[PDB]
Every structure is written in C-alpha cells, then in structure tokens.
Amino acid sequence: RIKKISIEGNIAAGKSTFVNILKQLSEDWEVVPEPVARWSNLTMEQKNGGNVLQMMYEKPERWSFTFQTYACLSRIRAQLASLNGKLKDAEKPVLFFERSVYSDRYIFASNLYESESMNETEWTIYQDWHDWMNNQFGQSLELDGIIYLQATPETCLHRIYLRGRNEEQGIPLEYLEKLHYKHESWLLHRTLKTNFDYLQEVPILTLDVNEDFKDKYESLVEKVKEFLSTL
Template structure:
C-alpha cells in the first residue's frame, strides 16, 4: 500500500499546484516555453535557430554535458580524472541499475535550469521570452514514466520519484512557471536517422523500438491528452505542434516558416 502523504502533498498530488499554466505574464516576467520532443528529433538545432532568429530571447539548453561528466564528492584526495562518471552512458548500459539515479539527477538539473533568474539583457527586452530544452514535466511524464513501464524503475522507486517531483514543484511554485510547450513532432524512423547522423557515443545502442515508445509517450501526453497528470493547470497548458519530419537544418525557407509559426503562437498566449 502506498504510504499516506502529509496533507500538503496530498493536495499537490490532487492538482493544487503549481499555478504555472494559463496565467497572464506579469510585468517584469517573461513568457516561458519548453521545447519537447523525442530523442534526436532536432531540439538542439531548433534551439540554435531560435537563438539566431530571436537573439534577445534567453535559451536554456538540455544539461547533457552534466550527465556525461558527474563529479563525485569524496573525502579522499584523488585526481580529478578519477572523480567523474558518465551517468548518461551508465543508464543506457545498465538501465535497471541506473534509471532511478539518472532520473533523479536529470529532474534536479532541469529544475535548476527553470529556477535560473532572468538575465539583465532579457529584463531590458520589451517582450521577454525564455526557452527551455525539455522540462521537469517531460522528465516525469515521458522518460521516468517510460522507464517505469519498461520495468527499469521499480514500483517503490517510481513512487519516491513522483513524491519528490510533486514536493519540489509545490515548494518552488510559480518560480518553475511555464506558459506552454513547443512540441517538435517527427516519426521515430526520422529520429533514428538523425540519431545515427549525430553519432553520440552513449546512444549507439538505441533501437527503433525505444524511440517508438517515447514517441507514443509524447503523443499521449501532448496531443491525445490521455496521460494522467497530477497538476490541474498542466492539463490545459497550450501545446503547439510543429512537424519537423523535413530536415530543416539546411533549408532557409523551412526555417523561416517554423520561426514565423513560433512567433505567432507566442502572440496567442
């Protein structure tokens, strides 16, 4: 039986937090959006394109480098070269051993990114926009959920992860606010093609089946709205779907059209 939570957490799980979505942007704050999508769908390329098109916006890239080089704290004097671990590689090699560790660290690193203060440059912008490459929400409702369903997270690990996730978002409230999602949508086959093209060593063993599973998770959460979410306002969060099955990286016309759509979407918030 799942242990009873304090009243504050039970209210959180019921959807009383955070008040992040569907709220008007307050003076001095920014529109905050997350780019979501499958592995190798083109999020980093899309983020760079946004930065080039809208240089006044503030971009937060996915902290992959932190996952690839985790420094361990030790009381013993050891060389720095012995003090790092590639957690991303570890979770792909032994998912049942490292999934809980990775998802906890991933959630924390995403949370830290969403808590970063607005830059001075952005504060001086008439219509400030912050863009995050994935969010604490996809961490839970895409990746951790999928690992649990695959059996790589045990039931007790999944319970602890969800309680921690809910508690942290309750504590930080509006500081983790998002106003909507940009969902980059492409077929799993196209994502696999791009994954092989970029050649990230940790990802070489990823199979099409795994990308198909993640695609289904994204569709269920962001398009079909069948994923059970635990935050009331998250259920009504604006989602803008952008089909990126076409390779837009070297297509100026396609890039211009994608940027036009993003700008138009933000005007609707």
C-alpha cells in the same frame, strides 16, 4: 513576465537544432539546453552527470532512480538560474527550455518504470519527490506554453544515424517508438493525466519536423511568433 516555453520532442527530433536557430533571431529570446545533453560527451554536476549517464546505460535497472532524480534536480537549477539571471532588459522576454520537469517525469521516468527499470517503490518515491519539489521551488517554473516538435521514430532514428555520435548508434528503434507514444498521448492526444492541473489547459503548438528545416525554417519560426502572440 518572462515567458517560459518548453521545446518537447523525441530523441534526435531536432530540439537542439531548433533552439540554436531560435536563439540567434531575437535579443529578447534566450535558451536553456537540458543538462542530460550537457552530460552527454568540468563542474561537480558534469562529473556526476557523466558517471551516472554511463552507469544508467550500463545498468538501467540499478540507476534509473538515481539518474532521474539528479537529471530533474539539475534541470530545475539550470532553469531557475536562467529565470533570475536573464532577460531583465528585454521588453518581450522569452525563455525557451529544452524539455521540462514534465518530460522528466511523464515521459522518461514514467517509461523507465513501465520498462521495469524502476520498481514500484522507486517510482512512488520519485513522484513524491517530484510532486513536492516542484510545487514550491519550481512553483513558478510554470510554462506559458509548449512547442511540440513532432518527428516519427524513423526520422529520429535517421537523425541519430545522421548525427553520427558513436555512443548512440545502438539506440534501438523500439525504444524510440516507446518515447514517441508517450509524447503523442500527452501533447497531441492529451489523454495522459498529470498532477499539475494547469497542464490540462496550457496551450501547445505542434510543428511537424520530419522535413529537414535547417536551411528552411521560416514557416516554423512564423508559426512560433504567431503562437507567442496568443499567449
């Protein structure tokens, strides 16, 4: 009865900015930052999170499997914690996930494989480890909906340029372009098949977020509220 909705989009699309706006508008609405975002900048996980982040950057062909598995594991734990810990005293509870286990596999992991940073065996083991590990533990992480925050690679690039973090100034447009295409095919075009038949029919809301919405988001929030009523 808690509604689970994932916020999808490219790097620097505005997902953190969006969910940080959404969380303050209602008591019935909670948020789960993706752990990779927390790793980027201390617990057992945060330490391993930092190290593997750096290792991955320094050698993706060595670390893409290690990182993807841990990133997904951590997300499932961060999400299950929120399902069981939050929104019991809410009449219309909504839980907004920053990305999803589907993003983990069908965007990031899938891209690393296609970039040759995972070999066939690693990608094959990862999919098995994902197919199985979600279809019980994170069985009822099933999402009620997806909000797709669509921004072009250039916007995202400028929002990386604008965010100003030293470590990401070097992310190349080509990669952003690569991630954009994977999102479009899953979320906009719907060609990409998955091993999770319900996702073929789960309702998506696309929002166009090229235009800065920081001072001006009501049309966007109006669209979210309207989307929630159809679920």
